[PDB]
Structure 1
Amino acid sequence: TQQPIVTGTSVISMKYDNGVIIAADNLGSYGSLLRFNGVERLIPVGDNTVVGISGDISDMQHIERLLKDLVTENAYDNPLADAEEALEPSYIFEYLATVMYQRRSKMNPLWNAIIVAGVQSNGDQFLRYVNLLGVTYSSPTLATGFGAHMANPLLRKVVDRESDIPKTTVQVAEEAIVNAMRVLYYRDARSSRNFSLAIIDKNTGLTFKKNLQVENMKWDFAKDIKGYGTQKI
């Protein structure tokens, strides 16, 4: 049993017709202190998977090393390490899920909420969630922390059920994600303007976008707002 110290906030994600999108801001908070502004919380595994991690950053860095070690180990005595016997999103997730539940069962959890986004060998979209309790679930849209409360509602207006996935293009999906990130910046007191976005497409592969910023923000209306009730000036 511990308490999280340096933390990362929401990770948001959604499926679209040819793959998955995942995003997460570049902030490492220290309570209310916005301590570290250059923290990458999307960690790609191979060219077909991206693991998005929220929660305790020291535990994230540990998970990061486990995945880095997983790739090394998979290459051992494996001539098809870059082909048929390469790591799948479903393999990477199940491994993490096992670890997360084992750790909670020893009463010493990895204080995280993880979303594994990727594309399988047969082109199928993979998107599944796991957290410090070892609880797992899959959905057309997945989000951690504040994202669950604010991002999902917006992303679910695009893909409300399974049958909406083939109707959703990568441009529409990315637009929805980028908008959700803006909404979180408005409303999450432990978020940052800078973020990273990753697209895993079955055709174009892994596109990893760093140093993105929330833009097109509405603030002008603030000038008109005065006092808290009766004040006019």
Structure 2
Amino acid sequence: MASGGSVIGVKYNGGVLLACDTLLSYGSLAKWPNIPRMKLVGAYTVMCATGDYADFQEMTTMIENHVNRQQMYGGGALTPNEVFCYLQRHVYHKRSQFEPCLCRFVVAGCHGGEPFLGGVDDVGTRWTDDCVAAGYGAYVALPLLRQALEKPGGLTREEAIRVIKDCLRVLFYRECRAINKFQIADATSDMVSIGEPFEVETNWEYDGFCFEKTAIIR
């Protein structure tokens, strides 16, 4: 029961970012710290999930084969909107046979100069928005990203990267099953690229964290 933690995404003026960490856990044990959890689908789309890794692998292998074959056999390249619809009907069908896909997905892409971002949960609920998250990202990160999207005009790429890193910083401080090693995917100009892993800067040296002040008996 290898499992992945949080995923977060946000739209900016010209594209969309998706981020998560490179870790799979088994219960509390941090078992594999060097796992690429984001998967490219066709020409325009990337996906990630929180929860059971085996179910993420089965579902994404199946969708990737359908997309490559439909193109090879003469039925065109599926868009992010169509891929998302297809994913959601598969998750709902499995829920309806009492054999659920125990993951929560985030999907991002770019097609037609128009960015896409959406989530699907394990009973088949679906939504699209300017920011989306799964796992603890839904409690920790959405509040920060929703405040950054309040400014009128939208975010630049640089502002979007900066607020994404503040979110990853808080997940590392406050989510138990996490490591400080993340990747960012960028969908813009009708393609997706995945960056190299990086780490964020953290603060541990406040006066209020010192040995004397935190002592229980004085």
What percent identity do the matched residue pairs reach? 30
Aligned residues: 217
Name which of 181, 187, 203 aligns with 1:218. 203
TM-score normalised to the size of structure 1? 0.86
- C-alpha contact 2:14 2:115 (8 A) present in aligned 1: yes
Establish whether residue 87 from structure 1 lines up as the match of residue 73 from structure 2. no
- C-alpha contact 1:146 1:184 (8 A) present in aligned 2: yes
Which amino acid in 1 is paired with 2:155? T
Name which of 121, 127, 134 aligns with 1:137. 127
Correspondence 1:1-233 to 2 at 5 A: 5-78=1-74, 85-120=76-111, 122-160=112-150, 164=152, 166-202=153-189, 205-213=191-199, 215-221=200-206, 224-226=210-212, 228=214, 231-232=217-218
Give, in whole Å, the separation in 2 of the partners of 1:95 and 1:147: 25
Describe the superposition over 1:58-84 as per-residue Cα deviations: whole angstroms up to 9, x where unpaired: 111112211321232222322xx7xxx
TM-score normalised to the size of structure 2? 0.92
Structure 1 residues 179-188 or 166-175, which shifts more?
A: 166-175
Distance apart, 1:206 and its partner CA:
2.1
What secondary structure is seen at the aligned counterpart in 2 of 1:219?
coil
What secondary structure is seen at the aligned counterpart in 2 of 1:137?
strand
Describe the superposition over 1:97-140 as per-residue Cα deviations: whole angstroms up to 9, x where unpaired: 111111111111111000111112x2222111001111111121
Runs of 4+ displaced beyond 2 Å:
225-232
What secondary structure is seen at the aligned counterpart in 1 of 2:67?
helix
- C-alpha contact 1:41 1:54 (8 A) present in aligned 2: no
Give, in whole Å, the separation in 2 of the partners of 1:195 and 1:216: 12
What secondary structure is seen at the aligned counterpart in 2 of 1:177?
helix
What secondary structure is seen at the aligned counterpart in 2 of 1:115?
strand
5+ residue gaps, structure 2: none
5+ residue gaps, structure 1: none
Give, in whole Å, the separation in 2 of the partners of 1:50 and 1:150: 23
Give, in whole Å, the separation in 2 of the partners of 1:206 and 1:48: 6
Distance apart, 1:202 and its partner CA:
2.8
